[PDB]
Amino acid sequence: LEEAAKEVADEVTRPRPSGEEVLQDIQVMLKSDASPSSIRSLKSDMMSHLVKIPGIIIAASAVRAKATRISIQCRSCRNTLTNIAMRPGLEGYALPRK
Amino acid sequence: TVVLDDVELREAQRDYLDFLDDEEDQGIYQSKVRELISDNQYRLIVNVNDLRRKNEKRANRLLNNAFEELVAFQRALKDFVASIDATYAKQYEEFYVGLEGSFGSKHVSPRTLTSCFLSCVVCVEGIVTKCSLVRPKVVRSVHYCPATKKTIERRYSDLSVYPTKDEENNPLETEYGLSVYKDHQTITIQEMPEKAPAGQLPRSVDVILDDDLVDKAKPGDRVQVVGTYRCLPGTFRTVLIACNVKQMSKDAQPSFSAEDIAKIKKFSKTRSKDIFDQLAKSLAPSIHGHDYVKKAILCLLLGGVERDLENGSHIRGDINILLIGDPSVAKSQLLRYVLCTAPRAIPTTGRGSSGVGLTAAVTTDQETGERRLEAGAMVLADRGVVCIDEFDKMSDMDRTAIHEVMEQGRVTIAKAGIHARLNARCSVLAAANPVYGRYDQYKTPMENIGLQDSLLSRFDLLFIMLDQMDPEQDREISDHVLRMHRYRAPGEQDGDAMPLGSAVKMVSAAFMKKYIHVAKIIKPVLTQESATYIAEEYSRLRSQDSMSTSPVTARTLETLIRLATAHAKARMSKTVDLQDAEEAVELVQYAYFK
Amino acid sequence: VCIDEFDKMREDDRVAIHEAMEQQTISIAKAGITTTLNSRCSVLAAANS
Amino acid sequence: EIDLAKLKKFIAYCRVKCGPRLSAEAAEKLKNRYIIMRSGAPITVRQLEAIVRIAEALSKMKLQPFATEADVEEALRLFQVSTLDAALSGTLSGVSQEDQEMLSRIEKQLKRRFASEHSIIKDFTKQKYPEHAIHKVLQLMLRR
Amino acid sequence: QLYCDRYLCDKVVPGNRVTIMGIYSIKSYIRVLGIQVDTDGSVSPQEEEEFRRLAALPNVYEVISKSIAPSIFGGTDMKKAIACLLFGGSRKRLPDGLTRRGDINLLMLGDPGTAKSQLLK
Ligand SMILES: Nc1ncnc2c1ncn2[C@@H]1O[C@H](COP(=O)(O)OP(=O)(O)O)[C@@H](O)[C@H]1O
Numbered sequence A: 001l002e003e004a005a006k007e008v009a010d011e012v013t014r015p016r017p018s019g020e021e022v023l024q025d026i027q028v029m030l031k032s033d034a035s036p037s038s039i040r041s042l043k044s045d046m047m048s049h050l051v052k053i054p055g056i057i058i059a060a061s062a063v064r065a066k067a068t069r070i071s072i073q074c075r076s077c078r079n080t081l082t083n084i085a086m087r088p089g090l091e092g093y094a095l096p097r098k
Numbered sequence B: 001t002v003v004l005d006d007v008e009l010r011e012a013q014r015d016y017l018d019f020l021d022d023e024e025d026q027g028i029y030q031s032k033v034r035e036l037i038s039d040n041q042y043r044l045i046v047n048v049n050d051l052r053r054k055n056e057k058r059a060n061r062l063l064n065n066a067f068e069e070l071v072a073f074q075r076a077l078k079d080f081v082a083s084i085d086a087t088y089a090k091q092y093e094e095f096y097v098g099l100e101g102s103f104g105s106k107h108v109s110p111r112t113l114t115s116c117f118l119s120c121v122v123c124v125e126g127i128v129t130k131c132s133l134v135r136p137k138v139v140r141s142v143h144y145c146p147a148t149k150k151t152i153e154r155r156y157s158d159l160s161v162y163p164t165k166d167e168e169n170n171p172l173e174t175e176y177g178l179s180v181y182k183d184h185q186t187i188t189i190q191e192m193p194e195k196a197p198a199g200q201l202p203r204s205v206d207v208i209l210d211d212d213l214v215d216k217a218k219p220g221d222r223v224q225v226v227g228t229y230r231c232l233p234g235t236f237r238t239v240l241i242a243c244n245v246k247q248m249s250k251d252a253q254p255s256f257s258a259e260d261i262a263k264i265k266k267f268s269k270t271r272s273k274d275i276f277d278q279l280a281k282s283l284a285p286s287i288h289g290h291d292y293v294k295k296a297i298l299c300l301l302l303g304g305v306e307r308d309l310e311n312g313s314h315i316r317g318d319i320n321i322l323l324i325g326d327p328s329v330a331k332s333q334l335l336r337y338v339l340c341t342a343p344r345a346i347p348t349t350g351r352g353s354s355g356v357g358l359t360a361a362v363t364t365d366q367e368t369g370e371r372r373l374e375a376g377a378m379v380l381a382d383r384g385v386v387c388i389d390e391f392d393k394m395s396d397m398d399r400t401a402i403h404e405v406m407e408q409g410r411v412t413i414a415k416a417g418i419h420a421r422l423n424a425r426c427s428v429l430a431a432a433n434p435v436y437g438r439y440d441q442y443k444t445p446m447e448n449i450g451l452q453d454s455l456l457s458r459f460d461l462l463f464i465m466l467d468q469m470d471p472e473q474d475r476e477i478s479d480h481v482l483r484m485h486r487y488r489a490p491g492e493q494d495g496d497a498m499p500l501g502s503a504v505k506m507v508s509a510a511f512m513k514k515y516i517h518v519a520k521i522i523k524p525v526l527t528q529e530s531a532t533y534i535a536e537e538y539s540r541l542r543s544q545d546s547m548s549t550s551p552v553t554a555r556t557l558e559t560l561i562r563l564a565t566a567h568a569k570a571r572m573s574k575t576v577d578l579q580d581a582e583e584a585v586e587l588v589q590y591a592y593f594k
Numbered sequence C: 001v002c003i004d005e006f007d008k009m010r011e012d013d014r015v016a017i018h019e020a021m022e023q024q025t026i027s028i029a030k031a032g033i034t035t036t037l038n039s040r041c042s043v044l045a046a047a048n049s
Numbered sequence D: 001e002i003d004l005a006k007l008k009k010f011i012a013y014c015r016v017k018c019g020p021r022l023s024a025e026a027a028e029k030l031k032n033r034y035i036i037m038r039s040g041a042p043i044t045v046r047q048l049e050a051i052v053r054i055a056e057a058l059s060k061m062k063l064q065p066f067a068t069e070a071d072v073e074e075a076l077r078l079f080q081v082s083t084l085d086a087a088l089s090g091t092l093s094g095v096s097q098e099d100q101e102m103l104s105r106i107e108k109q110l111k112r113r114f115a116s117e118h119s120i121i122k123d124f125t126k127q128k129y130p131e132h133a134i135h136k137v138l139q140l141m142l143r144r
Numbered sequence E: 001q002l003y004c005d006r007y008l009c010d011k012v013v014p015g016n017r018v019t020i021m022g023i024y025s026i027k028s029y030i031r032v033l034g035i036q037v038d039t040d041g042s043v044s045p046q047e048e049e050e051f052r053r054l055a056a057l058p059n060v061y062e063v064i065s066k067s068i069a070p071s072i073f074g075g076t077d078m079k080k081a082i083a084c085l086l087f088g089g090s091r092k093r094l095p096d097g098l099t100r101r102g103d104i105n106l107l108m109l110g111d112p113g114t115a116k117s118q119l120l121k
């Protein structure tokens, strides 16, 4: 859906000014009128399943930066693995074996 | 694996050199480098729009890829300087390029500085809060190996690692002269506190300064810096590398809309004399009485005009008012009005800001054990307003530190081996309940709280409000209070109250805020008539001083001058007026005489 | 907000409750920006001293 | 009598549905009464607003968009019970002309003595002075 | 644990009632994808009629006072004060846009031995 938003946005705004010609990614945020599911009514079944729940926020973190696209270099061999996507979520990283 | 030729870098460097080759054209950049050479500095300034005009493609290339393009640019600049003079180029190992001009999307604020701008040029505008000490950063270290009789070099740049042994473990001695070092300071910027929502969080951005850029900034300065926003080595941390810094004027201007200007000019020309009184009534309409106090508060907002003499004087235009009165009086409500009303204000308690307190303070980082000069609440209020509540509860250190800013408008700190002299020129509205309540009109105003009488001398005005049990007056206040209680919005059915939302004749606060901002731009000067009139009034007040608040002194004279100057702003008069001094005189007489 | 032994607040809490009752808001100052948290809550305090 | 949940449901329902205002007749009744307490005195403008909110709370029970003079009378009755409670609490606490007077007496006696620390405090406490009043006077002289 | 990265992030402050659309996930957290904020506010006819009935009662003040805390011993118009706190005043908006607290705050000083902890509970 995001890629669809990317293309349709581009062609709609195809003649961008100079410098603006570079296309930027789009966050296709979502919403719904469906009834929120109670937080207590949550089980492992809906893992990796879209859920809508109510709530009240107790704490917030600072606006930090997390890496989506990364590239690394083999320190000795110079072998470079470029444009590695890092999965969205609260994960760390993954180093190649060699 | 040795790079031989970069045609892109080759052409890009040539394009800059052609741009710098400003002889067929007006000579603006050729003159600049000539002036730079005479200046003996090594950081040229560049307007981006000139590059756009001469080559839009190159400018877009620069802004989208800041790092490599600048490296080509610095290459061209050094080559161009060497063309004009080789030896002067040989003085410096390198040269630097300062950007300037308009940036459509890349001109942002720390609030709006998104992660998307990484590797792009960005012109971040904001306010400095924290500054680190100047430190010499090593960039290129030369070593000598007596065993091999061989010299070895290393460059760090973006890249324990300090080499000390040859591969054969020969000792290495560092040629300190040949090694390259550069002063390097770090500061932090935040959004301008006036234009920032209370709901959102701080967005602090770290800035790196090097070479001449190091001490071209201090805490509590409104600046815009153009630089290359970059990540850091490792989820990552991100910092901005400065390419050029400039301290914009803190006054700025009320751009807003011409409609606001027309409405202001229309309203001002409607009743210029009554604008002062009308504003006062509409200043704090939720509170009945204390009209003279409202007049003074308006005078505080508009303030005076600083006068600076040949002797380096900085005779302040700011006004400082102290309010004392029993609890359950609208003093606190007055401050809420001023915060909502003032153009550039900031609240604070008797404690002051956490850790830093009222004025600045030195704080170790505790994440790396690194000293940081943190601006305080007072410093951020420079050329603005500060509202202090529970002013009696000020700490003794702050009770001393307030003296300097009240007198000189600048706070100094040499402690922790850290030297700084910050600007804190800020009209201050302080308030404090009397101790144990129950003010007595027999002791000094100091004795009811305790201020040493230096602060009372420093404050331009002191107003005392007492909880008099007059049935008529209490009826007037209470009837006003209940009228506010009974008041309901035109659109409502007397039913439910306002929703509990997550978000947070009489003129509007915003329009008033716009007008005082416009009035603050106005610079009313003195009139010989009013100067003669006020001088007689002061001498009259000296004659009144025979009778036995503080006695009239030269402090009171200058206080009246600022008050007339403030009223001169209130009517937008380009000069002071007898009305201005006359309003100030009665105001002062009301303050010292009940 | 039911508060048993309201006298035994923390000192920072004692600072915070001032604005809270006076404004129904908790203000946290981080340098210049001072974020605000709405607390339009009634309070039932209890104490002994 | 009413269920715990039912009371909660009523409380939420009336709150979200009704924020009562003050009727003009009830308002002037309170106004004259407020002046009487001031002349009799203590009552403050903060207490006036607190009484107003209590009256709104009372009328919100009956869901009246306006608060009656009887509703004001109910609030003043409860407030005056709190005011009598406040008088004895101020007697307990010592927080006030008499408090001002004894603090001045404490200041004068201390100046007579001087111008251990525990012994001084205990002797002042044994002279029919509160410890909090002694501590307050100590803080003030340090500030002064 | 909620995880908002792009423009969805930084749209909220702690304490707000909101409704999130996201993905249940475990490392146990949410990959949030959409947010709705209760920027204002958040009833069967029978409940309405009951509350209309109850408010119309002449001794609704007295019954509410007595009915709330019969379990506790030693209550006389403290129950009334607890009620009025629960009902609360009107969060008035002043003509010039300022606001006054709609709440009422009560203090129960005196004997900790008395079972007011039950009353708070
Ligand atoms: N002249 C007045 N007109 C209207 N309200 C007043 C007046 N004097 C006091 N008040 C009331 O006092 C309350 C605020 O008191 P506050 O300023 O916090 O006390 P202090 O500043 O002495 O600590 C407001 O609710 C306001 O209604």
Ligand SMILES: [Mg+2]
Pocket (backbone or CB within 6 Å): B331, B332, B389, B390
């Ligand atoms: Mg106050």
